[PDB]
PDB file of C-alpha atoms in Angstrom:
ATOM      1  CA  UNK A  11     -11.647   0.792 -12.690  1.00  0.00           C
ATOM      2  CA  UNK A  12     -10.025  -2.584 -12.031  1.00  0.00           C
ATOM      3  CA  UNK A  13      -9.928  -4.984 -14.967  1.00  0.00           C
ATOM      4  CA  UNK A  14      -8.950  -8.255 -13.292  1.00  0.00           C
ATOM      5  CA  UNK A  15     -12.469  -9.568 -13.864  1.00  0.00           C
ATOM      6  CA  UNK A  16     -11.620  -9.636 -17.583  1.00  0.00           C
ATOM      7  CA  UNK A  17      -9.410 -12.645 -16.852  1.00  0.00           C
ATOM      8  CA  UNK A  18      -9.959 -16.366 -16.412  1.00  0.00           C
ATOM      9  CA  UNK A  19      -8.053 -17.421 -13.303  1.00  0.00           C
ATOM     10  CA  UNK A  20      -6.172 -20.710 -12.952  1.00  0.00           C
ATOM     11  CA  UNK A  21      -5.043 -20.942  -9.328  1.00  0.00           C
ATOM     12  CA  UNK A  22      -1.665 -22.442  -8.392  1.00  0.00           C
ATOM     13  CA  UNK A  23      -0.578 -22.424 -12.013  1.00  0.00           C
ATOM     14  CA  UNK A  24       2.121 -20.682 -14.025  1.00  0.00           C
ATOM     15  CA  UNK A  25       3.266 -20.838 -17.640  1.00  0.00           C
ATOM     16  CA  UNK A  26       6.725 -21.946 -18.704  1.00  0.00           C
ATOM     17  CA  UNK A  27       7.926 -20.705 -22.067  1.00  0.00           C
ATOM     18  CA  UNK A  28       9.871 -23.273 -24.067  1.00  0.00           C
ATOM     19  CA  UNK A  29      10.125 -21.257 -27.278  1.00  0.00           C
ATOM     20  CA  UNK A  30      13.203 -18.978 -27.027  1.00  0.00           C
ATOM     21  CA  UNK A  31      11.568 -16.476 -29.388  1.00  0.00           C
ATOM     22  CA  UNK A  32       8.764 -15.695 -26.930  1.00  0.00           C
ATOM     23  CA  UNK A  33       9.351 -12.712 -24.644  1.00  0.00           C
ATOM     24  CA  UNK A  34       8.185 -11.840 -21.129  1.00  0.00           C
ATOM     25  CA  UNK A  35       8.209  -8.743 -18.920  1.00  0.00           C
ATOM     26  CA  UNK A  36       8.250  -8.687 -15.113  1.00  0.00           C
ATOM     27  CA  UNK A  37       7.897  -6.135 -12.321  1.00  0.00           C
ATOM     28  CA  UNK A  38       7.039  -6.216  -8.627  1.00  0.00           C
ATOM     29  CA  UNK A  39       3.729  -4.631  -7.617  1.00  0.00           C
ATOM     30  CA  UNK A  40       1.594  -4.333  -4.492  1.00  0.00           C
ATOM     31  CA  UNK A  41      -1.463  -6.189  -5.797  1.00  0.00           C
ATOM     32  CA  UNK A  42      -2.642  -8.554  -8.507  1.00  0.00           C
ATOM     33  CA  UNK A  43      -5.014  -5.796  -9.637  1.00  0.00           C
ATOM     34  CA  UNK A  44      -1.995  -3.734 -10.677  1.00  0.00           C
ATOM     35  CA  UNK A  45      -0.776  -6.623 -12.835  1.00  0.00           C
ATOM     36  CA  UNK A  46      -4.168  -6.910 -14.494  1.00  0.00           C
ATOM     37  CA  UNK A  47      -4.582  -3.185 -15.082  1.00  0.00           C
ATOM     38  CA  UNK A  48      -1.113  -2.873 -16.593  1.00  0.00           C
ATOM     39  CA  UNK A  49      -1.733  -5.926 -18.765  1.00  0.00           C
ATOM     40  CA  UNK A  50      -5.021  -4.656 -20.218  1.00  0.00           C
ATOM     41  CA  UNK A  51      -3.750  -1.103 -20.760  1.00  0.00           C
ATOM     42  CA  UNK A  52      -0.596  -2.529 -22.356  1.00  0.00           C
ATOM     43  CA  UNK A  53       0.899   0.961 -22.172  1.00  0.00           C
ATOM     44  CA  UNK A  54       4.360  -0.105 -21.015  1.00  0.00           C
ATOM     45  CA  UNK A  55       4.642  -3.449 -22.800  1.00  0.00           C
ATOM     46  CA  UNK A  56       6.440  -4.214 -26.122  1.00  0.00           C
ATOM     47  CA  UNK A  57       3.614  -6.564 -27.106  1.00  0.00           C
ATOM     48  CA  UNK A  58      -0.093  -7.260 -26.657  1.00  0.00           C
ATOM     49  CA  UNK A  59      -0.457  -8.626 -23.126  1.00  0.00           C
ATOM     50  CA  UNK A  60      -2.669 -11.705 -23.217  1.00  0.00           C
ATOM     51  CA  UNK A  61      -2.093 -13.084 -19.741  1.00  0.00           C
ATOM     52  CA  UNK A  62      -0.086 -12.721 -16.565  1.00  0.00           C
ATOM     53  CA  UNK A  63       1.030 -14.701 -13.550  1.00  0.00           C
ATOM     54  CA  UNK A  64       1.106 -13.212 -10.081  1.00  0.00           C
ATOM     55  CA  UNK A  65       3.770 -14.543  -7.735  1.00  0.00           C
ATOM     56  CA  UNK A  66       1.874 -14.191  -4.459  1.00  0.00           C
ATOM     57  CA  UNK A  67       4.968 -14.560  -2.282  1.00  0.00           C
ATOM     58  CA  UNK A  68       7.218 -12.093  -4.113  1.00  0.00           C
ATOM     59  CA  UNK A  69       4.374  -9.818  -5.241  1.00  0.00           C
ATOM     60  CA  UNK A  70       5.712 -10.112  -8.768  1.00  0.00           C
ATOM     61  CA  UNK A  71       3.845  -9.739 -12.052  1.00  0.00           C
ATOM     62  CA  UNK A  72       4.867 -11.765 -15.080  1.00  0.00           C
ATOM     63  CA  UNK A  73       3.255 -10.365 -18.258  1.00  0.00           C
ATOM     64  CA  UNK A  74       2.944 -12.611 -21.322  1.00  0.00           C
ATOM     65  CA  UNK A  75       2.238 -12.017 -25.041  1.00  0.00           C
ATOM     66  CA  UNK A  76       0.795 -15.544 -24.956  1.00  0.00           C
ATOM     67  CA  UNK A  77      -1.477 -17.822 -22.924  1.00  0.00           C
ATOM     68  CA  UNK A  78      -1.899 -21.523 -22.095  1.00  0.00           C
ATOM     69  CA  UNK A  79      -3.064 -22.372 -25.624  1.00  0.00           C
ATOM     70  CA  UNK A  80      -0.022 -20.878 -27.348  1.00  0.00           C
ATOM     71  CA  UNK A  81       2.666 -23.046 -28.952  1.00  0.00           C
ATOM     72  CA  UNK A  82       5.946 -23.378 -27.079  1.00  0.00           C
ATOM     73  CA  UNK A  83       4.226 -22.861 -23.739  1.00  0.00           C
ATOM     74  CA  UNK A  84       3.559 -25.355 -20.952  1.00  0.00           C
ATOM     75  CA  UNK A  85       1.561 -25.171 -17.727  1.00  0.00           C
ATOM     76  CA  UNK A  86       3.155 -26.016 -14.392  1.00  0.00           C
ATOM     77  CA  UNK A  87       1.766 -26.231 -10.860  1.00  0.00           C
ATOM     78  CA  UNK A  88       2.960 -24.027  -8.026  1.00  0.00           C
ATOM     79  CA  UNK A  89       1.445 -22.968  -4.709  1.00  0.00           C
ATOM     80  CA  UNK A  90       2.727 -19.405  -4.966  1.00  0.00           C
ATOM     81  CA  UNK A  91       1.563 -18.713  -8.532  1.00  0.00           C
ATOM     82  CA  UNK A  92      -1.818 -17.763  -9.997  1.00  0.00           C
ATOM     83  CA  UNK A  93      -2.392 -17.558 -13.765  1.00  0.00           C
ATOM     84  CA  UNK A  94      -4.766 -15.006 -15.257  1.00  0.00           C
ATOM     85  CA  UNK A  95      -5.665 -15.245 -18.953  1.00  0.00           C
ATOM     86  CA  UNK A  96      -7.613 -12.430 -20.575  1.00  0.00           C
ATOM     87  CA  UNK A  97     -10.839 -13.848 -21.989  1.00  0.00           C
ATOM     88  CA  UNK A  98     -10.365 -11.807 -25.163  1.00  0.00           C
ATOM     89  CA  UNK A  99      -7.775 -14.282 -26.409  1.00  0.00           C
ATOM     90  CA  UNK A 100      -9.136 -17.552 -25.028  1.00  0.00           C
ATOM     91  CA  UNK A 101     -10.305 -20.137 -27.585  1.00  0.00           C
TER      92      UNK A 101
END
C-alpha cells in the first residue's frame, strides 16, 4: 500500500528552488506516508512528482516536479525537514 520505500531519503535536508519557472505544491498531512502516496499517484498534481520534503514540525508536504540533481535547485540543511527523492528519477 504505502510507497515511501520507493524514495531515497536525505534526512535534515530540503530543496530550495532558484529557478522562478519551477513550480511546487504544498499541503498539510498527518504522515510522511501520505506525502509519498500522493506524490507517486500524482493524481492531484499539475506535474510529475519526482520528490517531496516533509516538514516534520508543521506536518507539511512539499511536492516537487524536480529533485536534487535538477538545474535551478539547491540543497539546504534543516533539522525539521526530510527530503525524499523517488528512485525512478535519480541518476
